[PDB]
């Protein structure tokens, strides 16, 4: 039976003195041709057992429905990447990776610029 499991057992959601915040590692502003593939690789400095990764574009939360279908979002165990396949001019803008945990929140951005290969 599809049941999520994994209880969000909170204790250190503001009193985590000693433990580090989930600091995302800075992604790159990448320029590429229309029809190319750009992978935004965003992970935390230290891996944690409760990292909720989210992708935004101009502050708009890219859910499965809000996400353009040429892009495929992959949430790996403790990291997440944004594989923008056949990236067109419609894929231009800042894609922000986000992390939501007990220890805190953090966000790294990347300006995806696409040009027509003339």
UniProtKB/Swiss-Prot annotation:
Glycosylation sites noted in the Swiss-Prot or TrEMBL record: 105, 111
Disulfide bond residue pairs: 42-97
Domain of life: Eukaryota
Domain spans labelled Ig-like C2-type: 22-113
Site (Breakpoint for translocation to form gamma-heregulin): 19
Location(s) in or outside the cell: Secreted
The protein's name in its UniProt record: Neuregulin-1
From-to range in the entire protein, with total length: 34 to 133 of 640
């Amino acid at each position: 039976m599809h049941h999520h499991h994994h209880h969000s057992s909170g204790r250190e959601n503001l009193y985590f003195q000693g433990a580090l915040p989930p600091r995302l590692k800075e992604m790159k502003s990448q320029e590429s041709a229309a029809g190319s593939k750009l992978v935004l690789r965003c992970e935390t400095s230290s891996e944690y057992s409760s990292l909720r990764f989210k992708w935004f574009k101009n502050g708009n939360e890219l859910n499965r429905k809000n996400k353009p279908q040429n892009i495929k979002i992959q949430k790996k165990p403790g990291k997440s990447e944004l594989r923008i396949n056949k990236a067109s001019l419609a894929d231009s803008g800042e894609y922000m990776c986000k992390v939501i945990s007990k220890l805190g929140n953090d966000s790294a951005s990347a300006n995806i610029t696409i040009v027509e290969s003339n």
